[PDB]
């Protein structure tokens, strides 16, 4: 569980929740995925600001699977690790 | 080439190549936050918040002792950066 390792999920201007993705036919069986709490980002006054967006940061990771559902197959999956705040103006 | 959030984020980052011939994958791209603060509404680095790396625990392959035997090692990699504040709302 990443909640016990880091609390950036609660302190970020683009906070997130962690959801357990369970699969017995896959190794690791449990994968924790970040889901952005808001569409906007939290501003200085504590309000959800829609001049920016919370977006998930994804990582391509290889996983082990039992196929057909002796043999194992290495499968590529995309996982959300956390969220960042993006703006339409690049400085 | 897959995502440009590194340039559009209020906590932007650069990607650095971590090379290791005794590890598979040999090359791992790691995020390094560009600034200590975060980019505010006016385009300035704001030090009332901090850019922090989001790290992921990932398994890698290593040659141990340093051609026949390998070890599966859990490593920590920075995937990107987020902006944190000292006031939680």
């Amino acid at each position, epitope marked *: 569980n990443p909640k016990r390792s880091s609390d950036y999920y609660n302190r970020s201007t683009s906070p997130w929740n962690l959801h357990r993705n369970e699969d017995p036919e896959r190794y690791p069986s449990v994968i924790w995925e970040a*889901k952005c709490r808001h*569409l*906007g980002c939290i501003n200085a006054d504590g309000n*959800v*600001d*829609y*001049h*920016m*967006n919370s*977006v*998930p940061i*994804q990582q391509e990771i290889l996983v082990l699977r039992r196929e057909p559902p002796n043999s194992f197959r290495l499968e590529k999956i995309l996982v*959300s690790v956390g969220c960042t705040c*993006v*703006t*339409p*103006i690049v400085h | *080439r*897959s*995502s*440009d*959030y590194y340039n*559009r984020s209020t906590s932007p980052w650069n990607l650095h190549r971590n090379e290791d011939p005794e590890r598979y994958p040999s090359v791992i791209w790691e995020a390094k936050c560009r600034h200590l603060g975060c980019i505010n509404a006016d385009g300035n680095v704001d030090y009332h918040m901090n850019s922090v790396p989001i790290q992921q625990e990932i398994l890698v392959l290593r040659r141990e002792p340093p051609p026949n035997s390998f070890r599966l090692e859990k490593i920590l990699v920075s995937v990107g950066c987020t902006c944190v504040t000292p006031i939680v709302h």
Partner: antibody
Amino acid sequence: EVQLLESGGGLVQPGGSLRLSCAASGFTFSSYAMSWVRQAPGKGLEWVSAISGSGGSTYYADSVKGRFTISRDNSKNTLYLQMNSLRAEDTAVYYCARDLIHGVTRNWGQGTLVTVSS
Amino acid sequence: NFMLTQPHSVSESPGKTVTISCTRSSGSLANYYVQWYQQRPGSSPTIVIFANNQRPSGVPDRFSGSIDSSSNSASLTISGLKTEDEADYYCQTYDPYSVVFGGGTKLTVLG
């Protein structure tokens, strides 16, 4: 250079279905929210639907709720719009649009004409 | 839901300054970015202004965007009006769910 190429338009009978595609190139597709906007001949621009970069969040105009489905294939750099229960009022040029954030469109495609008629 | 009201048409002589307004019916205008698009006959819309006042490269310095929170309206101003500025102009903004375009303004360059 940003390129958005729509396909799939043509004639549909009222009550029929049609799927539109938009092939994107020149930008990192999966990091952009995308939109569909339509325009009936000699009329104004009308927002239809939007989708987050990941595809995790979707948004619809009241006029198309339940009938249309926006989706994307990030491995194919393609945006789709599935339209069911089409009616004469859905006749329009449909544009694919790239958004910098939700609601801020930065680029438009060439459009594809959809005609709903018996 | 909300609406954006724009004038049906605006007119001015060459070299003059023209302003096109866009009034939001509900919700605070300053909470959400305003975009302006130009549409020429038989063409796709092109962006003139994004994020209230940002001008992309290729858009003349004559085009500028502004917002007025007191009146809950945004404006597209064209200084030194040219005949090539004849086109339809649309304002656009959003809320946390919807995206809305104004009805559009036909710009006529007089004389």
